[PDB]
Structure formats: structure tokens, C-alpha cells
Ligand code: HEM
């Protein structure tokens with residue numbers, strides 16, 4: 030889906046999946062060879078990938094509550 034909701038014990042995360050493709054050139058930057066559900070998706074994968082990219086690019090939320098907005 031273009032907008033994906035991630036339930037979380039630390040607050041739901043609203044992910045603009047489609048919008049992110051306007052900023053991220055490759056599906057592979059977040060996906061395995063085949064784009065689709067990510068088997069090991071969770072805290073570790075998310076904090077490394079989601080937070081990590083935001084940190085390196087200086088755009089996107091890195092503060093807990095700015096991502097865990099639910
Ligand atoms: C045009 C390239 C992309 C394609 C073809 C693609 C395709 C998909 C598909 C088919 C799904 C599964 C939807 C479902 O659950 O039915 C999905 C989920 C997802 N995609 Fe993408 N995606 C692309 C780019 C991105 C990018 C750039 C990111 C990271 C910024 C990303 C992150 C994710 C995440 C986190 C999920 C949820 C996985 C899960 O809940 O297991 N995608 N994507």
C-alpha cells in the first residue's frame with residue numbers, strides 16, 4: 030500500500046511508502062531482491078534502516094516520538 034501503518038508498543042508508525050520512492054531511488058535500499066513483505070521487519074530492522082537513512086541524509090525523523098506518532 031502507498032501508506033503503511035505499523036502498530037508498535039512504543040506508538041504506531043505511519044509510513045509513507047509510495048512517497049518515499051520520490052526520495053529513494055531503489056526499492057532494494059529497503060527490500061530484499063524481490064520487493065514485498067520483509068520477513069525480519071521489526072525494531073532492529075527499522076531502527077537500522079528507517080532511522081539510519083534519516084540520520085545520514087539529515088532529513089526524516091530521528092527523534093523517537095517524531096516517528097512513533099501513534
Ligand atoms: C519501487 C520500489 C518498491 C517496490 C516495488 C516496493 C514494493 C513493496 C511491496 C509489494 C510491499 C508489500 C505490500 C504488502 O504487504 O502487501 C512493500 C512493503 C514495504 N516496503 Fe516497499 N517497495 C518499494 C520501495 C520501498 C522503499 C524505498 C522502502 C524504504 C524507504 C520500502 C519499504 C517497505 C516496507 C518497510 C514495507 C513493509 C514490509 C513489511 O511490513 O513486512 N519500499 N513494498
Ligand code: HEM
Pocket residue numbers: 042043044045048049052053058059075078079080082083086088089090095096
Ligand atoms: C520503514 C522505515 C521508514 C520509516 C518508518 C520512515 C518514516 C518517515 C517519516 C515519518 C517521514 C516524515 C515525512 C513523511 O512521513 O512522508 C520520513 C521522511 C523521510 N524519509 Fe523516511 N522512513 C523510513 C525509511 C526511510 C529510508 C530507508 C530512507 C532513505 C534510504 C528514508 C528517507 C527519508 C527522507 C529523505 C525523508 C524526508 C522527506 C521530506 O523531505 O519530506 N526514509 N520518513
Ligand code: HEM
Pocket residue numbers: 035036037038039042070071072075076079080083090091092093094095096097
Ligand atoms: C531512540 C528513539 C526510539 C525509541 C526509544 C524507539 C523504540 C522502539 C521500540 C521499543 C520498538 C519495539 C516496540 C514493540 O515491541 O512493538 C520500536 C519499533 C520500531 N520503531 Fe522505534 N524507536 C525509536 C525511534 C524510531 C524512529 C526514529 C523510527 C522511524 C524513523 C522508528 C520506527 C520503528 C518501527 C517501524 C518499529 C517496528 C514496528 C513493527 O514491529 O512493525 N523508531 N521502536
